[PDB]
Amino acid sequence: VIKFRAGVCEYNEDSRLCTPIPVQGEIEIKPNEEEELGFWDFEWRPTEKPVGRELDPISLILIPGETMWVPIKSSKSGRIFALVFSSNERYFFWLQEKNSGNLPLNELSAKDKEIYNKMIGVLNNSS
Amino acid sequence: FYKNKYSSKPYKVDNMTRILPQQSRYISFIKDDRFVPVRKFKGNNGVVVLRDREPKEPVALIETVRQMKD
């Protein structure tokens, strides 16, 4: 297994402002052995600091075309990963990878190339 | 020699190489790149702001240690 730090967003359905609220939770990438069309389990739990949005430990699944990556949806902060389940378990997440820093600028982080590889690879294909 | 003929003999030199303090007086800016100093040049080595006026021309770039690590 591989762990990375991950943040929440401010959750709404008003227009989906999705501002990053940085907290200090963690994703846990799990590679599975189902499919090859994209099937990964992203476990978001706030290891520390839950202050930002009311969330509780959860492992959320990847089924294609329902889990979509959008490079900017804040309109001043990139890297918005979006899960849509029709407000049953819709959540927005923004990663706090430390292989490309935590920068919240237009045109992703400064180290772009790490982010471009990782995000496409997980949606389309799976281990 | 100690000498050739300074103020003559053209050749190009890449930015962010070892610029000698005996060749930092003859750094002369070209006009096919937007980059020229906003005011009259120092005559010396250092950080100097060169103006970009087209970001539709992406030019070669050297990341700082900040950008790479982040």
Swiss-Prot record, chain A:
GO terms for biological process: proteasome-mediated ubiquitin-dependent protein catabolic process; ubiquitin-dependent protein catabolic process. Its main location: cytoplasm. It is found in: Cytoplasm; Nucleus. The modification Phosphoserine is found at residue 127. Residues 1-126 form the Pru domain. It comes from the Eukaryota. The keyword Nucleotide-binding does not apply. GO terms for cellular component: nucleus; proteasome complex; proteasome regulatory particle, lid subcomplex; proteasome storage granule. Present with 12200 molecules/cell in log phase SD medium. Component of the 19S cap proteasome complex composed of at least RPN1, RPN2, RPN3, RPN4, RPN5, RPN6, RPN7, RPN8, RPN9, RPN10, RPN11, RPN12, RPN13, RPT1, RPT2, RPT3, RPT4, RPT5, and RPT6. The 19S subcomplex associates with the 20S proteasome subcomplex to form the functional 26S proteasome. Belongs to the RPN13 family. This is 26S proteasome regulatory subunit RPN13. It comes from Saccharomyces cerevisiae (strain ATCC 204508 / S288c).
From Swiss-Prot, chain B:
Interacts with UBR1. Coiled coil: none annotated. Present with 4750 molecules/cell in log phase SD medium. It comes from Saccharomyces cerevisiae (strain ATCC 204508 / S288c) (Baker's yeast). This is 26S proteasome regulatory subunit RPN2. N-acetylated by NAT1. The chain holds residues 856 to 925 of 945 of the full protein. Belongs to the proteasome subunit S1 family. Acts as a regulatory subunit of the 26S proteasome which is involved in the ATP-dependent degradation of ubiquitinated proteins. Disulfide bonds: none annotated. It comes from the Eukaryota.
